[PDB]
Ligand binder design. Structure first.
Ligand SMILES: Cc1cc2nc3c(=O)[nH]c(=O)nc-3n(C[C@H](O)[C@H](O)[C@H](O)COP(=O)(O)OP(=O)(O)OC[C@H]3O[C@@H](n4cnc5c(N)ncnc54)[C@H](O)[C@@H]3O)c2cc1C
Ligand SMILES: Cc1cc2nc3c(=O)[nH]c(=O)nc-3n(C[C@H](O)[C@H](O)[C@H](O)COP(=O)(O)OP(=O)(O)OC[C@H]3O[C@@H](n4cnc5c(N)ncnc54)[C@H](O)[C@@H]3O)c2cc1C
Ligand SMILES: O=c1ccn([C@@H]2O[C@H](COP(=O)(O)OP(=O)(O)O[C@H]3O[C@H](CO)[C@H](O)[C@H](O)[C@H]3O)[C@@H](O)[C@H]2O)c(=O)[nH]1
Ligand SMILES: O=c1ccn([C@@H]2O[C@H](COP(=O)(O)OP(=O)(O)O[C@H]3O[C@H](CO)[C@H](O)[C@H](O)[C@H]3O)[C@@H](O)[C@H]2O)c(=O)[nH]1
Ligand code: NA
Ligand code: NA
Lengths: 386, 386
C-alpha cells in the first residue's frame, strides 16, 4: 500500500510516532498537517530583518532527566550547552530568580546565610499553616510569607490566569519555591540545551526518512474519508483537538491562549538576558523574551545594532485563538472524562489512537510528549501494525 | 638503559612532557618528585572527617579555548559540566560578580539597561583618562569610576598584593572590567569543567604508563650525580626553581605566597556557593572557598551536616613558604634575564631543559603549562631524544 499508518499532526508527539514506525518497523507513514510547516508549536523560524531565530508559538526550552528521551533526540540534532536562567523585574529592580539567597539578599536588604535564610522563611511564613490554606494566595503565604508573595507571585499569577489568586486552588502550589543557596539554574533536569541549528531543522530531520510522506496545509477532517478508503486497515494516530474530533458533542473544552507582540529594536541589546519576568501589575505582559540571547554562540551572524524582542500576554482562548494550556475546571474535567470514553470506543471500532497535547487535553513539555509517543509506539502501535 | 629521559617535578608541565615521551616516542622516563605525591600544586585529596575533595595548594579551576589541550586532557580524565561563578561580599551584601548589569543594579540601586549602563560607566569614569593614569588606582578609576573602584577593587587588591594600589603599575589593568549584560560566567573560555574523579586521579592517570617510573620523596639535587652517571646521554627536563638550580648566584627571585586556613563546620552549607570574595579591608582573607559546591554531583556522598571551608590569605613568600606567584619587580626581571642566559648555557652543555612555573619564573594556568610542555616536546625533545 502507499501508506501503512496515518499520523494527524506533526508536533513532537506525531513526529516521534511516525519516525519510530518508519525506522523501527519499516512501515510507510503518511503525516497530515494542517499548518504550512512541520513541528507544531515547537517550530521556529528566522525573523526576516535580522535573521535571528524566533518563535511564533512560545519560546521553547529543552530539558529532561529521561535518558532514553535524551539519547533519542540527539539522533536528530545536536544541542548547545545553553542553560536557562530567568530574572524578575519588580519595582524597578531586576532580581535574581527563582527565589534563593540572591533574591533574598536583594529584597530583604542584606546577606543571609543558608541557615539564616531558612530561619527567615520560617518567620515570614509562620502566619498560615499550609494544612489550613483554602486557596492559592493562602497556600503561597503559608510557604514563603506575605512580602515575598506580594512582590513576586501575586500579580504575575493574576496576569497569567486572569483571576484573583484568592480564587485559585491551594493545590496549584505543591512545594517550597525557595532555594537556600545561590544556584539560579532555572531548570533542575540532568540534560538541557537548545538545538544547534534551530528547532525547524531538528523537527524536519525527524520527518526526513525514506518511509515518511508529509502533506502540509491539509486538514484531516477534509481528507480523511478519501485517505482511509485507499487503505482501510491502516491505523490512525490523531493528535488534533479531542473535542473537535467528536463534533463538540459533549461541549467545548476550555483553554488559555497567549498573544505575542514581537518587535525589532534599533539596539544590539535590549535587556542583556534571554527572559525578563515582569512581576508588577502595571505591566500588562508577563515577560519579555530577547531571542538573540538564546543563541550566544551565533553572535557573529546576529546584527550588531538590532535585536528582536517579544512581549507575552495571557488570556482565555476564544474562537480563532490558538489553544495552548488546558484550563481544567471541574466542568472541563467531566466533559474530558466523557470524551475519553468516546475516544476509547473509537480506538476499538476505527483503529484511531489519541495522543499529544490536543488529543488528550493535557499540557506536555517536549520531552514528555516524546516519552508519551514512545510509550504509545511500544505498547499499542507495534501490535496494531503487525 | 633503565631510563632515556629524566623529568624533575611532577606538576602538569612535567607530567605532560613525561607522558608524551613515554607514549609518542616509546621512551623510558624517570620522574623525580620532591613531595610525597604527584601533580604539583594541582593535586587534591579527601578531607579525612568529611570525605570532601579539597586542595592544599589553592583551588584549581580548569578552563581553556585551546582545543588541542582540551582533547589531550580528556584522554586522562572526563570533566564535569561545572561552570565557575563568583560572588563579592561588600558591606554586608553578596553582589553578583564580575561587574555587570547585576552588580550595577544592586550597587546603584535600580535596573540599568545595557545602553544605560554604558552611559553610567562613561559618566562615572569621566574623571581620569586612561592615557593619563600613572598607577593602578588611577587606571582603575579611569575605567570604572571611584564608587565601583573603592567598593570592589581597592581593598581586595591591597590585601592580595600587600601594597597600596597607588603604588602599583597602571599596566596591571588592561581592559574594561565591566560587562553590559547579565552574564556572570566567571571564565570566558570555550571549554571548562572539573575532573570527574578529582585531580589526584587525573594526574595519577597521566603518569600511569608502562614506560614511566615515578620516584616520590626525592630531591633532584640530592640524587642527580648518581642518576646521570647511570646514563649520561639522557636529557633532563627540570621544572624546579630556576634560581635555586644555579645556587642563587644571581640573587633570590621574589615570590608571593598564600596561607590557607581550612575548617570543618557543623553545618551542611556555609555560604551556598563555591567561592565568596571578601572585598572589604576589615576581613583579613581575600576569599572563602566551600569545597563541596565544586562537586554538586557528589551530594549524596557528602555529609548532610558538615562542610569544609577555607580562608585564603596573601603575603610575601619568606624562607620556608611555598612560592606561588612571581612578583616581577624590575629587580626580579633583571636577575631573571641573567638566569635565562645561565639556563640556555646549561641546555647546551648539559642537555638540561628548563620549563614550568618554577623553572621559568612565570605563573602558568594548567592549560598554559600543558601547552608549553607540548611545545617543548614538539620543538626540542623529539630531536634531543633521537
Ligand atoms: C506557549 C508554549 C510554550 C511551550 N514551551 C515549551 C518549553 O519551553 N519546553 C518544552 O519542553 N515544551 C514546551 N511547550 C510544549 C511543546 O510545544 C510540545 O512539543 C507540545 O506540547 C507537544 O505536544 P504535541 O506534539 O501533541 O502538540 P502540537 O505541538 O500542538 O502539535 C499538534 C499538531 O497537530 C496539528 N493539527 C491539529 N489539528 C489538525 C488537523 N485537523 N489536521 C491536521 N493537523 C492538525 C497542529 O497544526 C500541530 O502542528 C510549549 C508549548 C506552548 C504552547
Ligand atoms: C595558588 C594556586 C592556584 C592555582 N589555581 C589554578 C586554577 O584555578 N586554574 C589553573 O588552570 N591553574 C591554576 N594554578 C596553576 C597550576 O598549579 C598549574 O598546574 C601549575 O602552575 C603548572 O606549572 P608546573 O607544572 O611547572 O608547576 P608545579 O605544579 O609547581 O609542579 C612543580 C613540581 O616540581 C616539584 N619539584 C620542585 N623542586 C624539585 C626538586 N628539587 N626535585 C624534585 N621535584 C621538585 C614540586 O614539588 C612540584 O610537584 C594555580 C596555581 C597556584 C599556585
Ligand atoms: O515570576 C514568577 C514566575 C512564576 N510564578 C508562578 O509560577 C507559575 C508558573 O510559572 P511560569 O508559567 O512562568 O513558568 P514554568 O516554570 O511553569 O514553565 C516555563 O517553562 C516551560 C518549559 O518547561 C514553558 O516554557 C513555560 O511556558 C514556561 O512558563 C505562575 O503561574 C505563577 O503562579 C510566579 O508567581 N512568579
Ligand atoms: O573581587 C575582586 C576580584 C579581583 N580583583 C582584581 O583582579 C585581580 C586578580 O583577581 P583574582 O586573583 O582574584 O582572580 P583571577 O581572575 O586573576 O584568577 C583566578 O583564577 C585562576 C584560574 O585561572 C586562579 O584560580 C587564581 O588563583 C584565581 O584568582 C586582583 O588582584 C584585583 O586587582 C578585584 O579587584 N576584586
Ligand atoms: Na506556614
Ligand atoms: Na576615563
Amino acid at each position: 500500500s502507499d501508506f501503512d499508518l496515518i499520523v494527524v499532526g506533526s508536533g513532537l508527539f506525531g513526529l516521534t510516532v511516525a519516525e519510530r514506525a518508519a525506522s523501527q518497523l519499516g512501515k510507510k507513514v503518511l503525516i497530515v498537517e494542517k499548518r504550512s510547516h512541520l513541528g507544531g508549536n515547537a517550530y521556529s523560524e528566522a525573523e526576516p530583518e535580522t535573521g535571528i531565530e524566533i518563535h511564533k508559538y512560545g519560546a521553547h526550552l529543552f530539558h529532561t532527566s529521561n535518558k532514553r528521551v535524551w539519547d533519542y533526540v540527539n539522533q536528530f540534532t545536536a544541542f548547545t550547552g545553553y542553560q536557562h536562567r530567568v530574572f524578575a523585574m519588580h519595582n524597578g529592580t531586576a532580581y535574581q530568580f527563582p527565589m534563593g539567597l540572591g533574591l533574598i539578599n536583594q529584597f530583604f536588604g542584606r546577606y543571609y546565610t543558608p541557615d539564616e535564610a531558612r530561619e527567615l522563611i520560617k518567620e515570614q511564613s509562620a502566619e498560615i499553616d499550609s494544612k489550613d490554606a483554602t486557596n492559592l494566595e493562602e497556600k503561597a503565604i503559608s510557604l514563603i510569607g506575605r512580602p515575598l508573595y506580594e512582590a513576586f507571585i501575586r500579580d504575575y499569577t493574576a496576569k497569567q490566569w486572569q483571576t484573583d489568586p484568592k480564587e485559585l486552588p491551594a493545590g496549584n502550589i505543591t512545594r517550597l519555591p525557595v532555594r537556600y543557596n545561590f544556584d539560579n539554574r532555572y531548570f533542575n533536569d540532568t540534560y538541557e540545551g537548545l538545538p544547534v541549528d534551530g528547532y525547524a531543522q531538528w523537527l524536519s530531520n525527524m520527518a526526513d526518512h525514506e518511509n515518511i510522506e508529509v502533506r502540509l496545509d491539509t486538514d484531516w477532517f477534509e481528507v480523511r474519508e478519501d485517505l482511509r478508503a485507499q487503505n482501510p486497515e491502516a491505523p490512525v494516530v490523531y493528535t488534533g483537538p479531542l473535542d473537535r474530533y467528536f463534533d463538540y458533542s459533549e461541549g467545548h473544552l476550555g483553554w488559555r491562549t497567549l498573544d505575542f507582540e514581537t518587535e525589532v529594536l534599533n539596539t544590539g541589546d535590549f535587556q542583556g538576558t534571554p527572559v525578563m519576568n515582569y512581576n508588577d501589575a502595571e505591566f500588562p505582559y508577563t515577560r519579555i523574551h530577547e531571542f538573540r540571547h538564546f543563541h550566544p554562540e551565533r553572535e557573529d551572524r546576529h546584527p550588531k545594532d538590532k535585536t528582536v524582542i517579544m512581549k507575552e500576554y495571557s488570556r482565555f482562548a476564544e474562537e480563532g485563538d490558538e489553544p495552548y494550556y488546558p484550563i481544567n475546571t471541574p466542568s472541563d474535567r467531566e466533559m474530558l472524562f466523557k470524551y475519553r470514553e468516546l475516544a476509547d470506543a473509537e480506538t476499538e471500532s476505527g483503529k484511531v489512537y489519541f495522543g499529544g497535547r490536543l488529543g488528550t487535553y493535557q499540557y506536555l513539555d517536549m520531552h514528555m510528549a516524546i516519552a508519551s509517543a514512545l510509550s504509545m509506539f511500544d505498547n499499542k502501535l507495534v501490535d496494531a501494525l503487525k
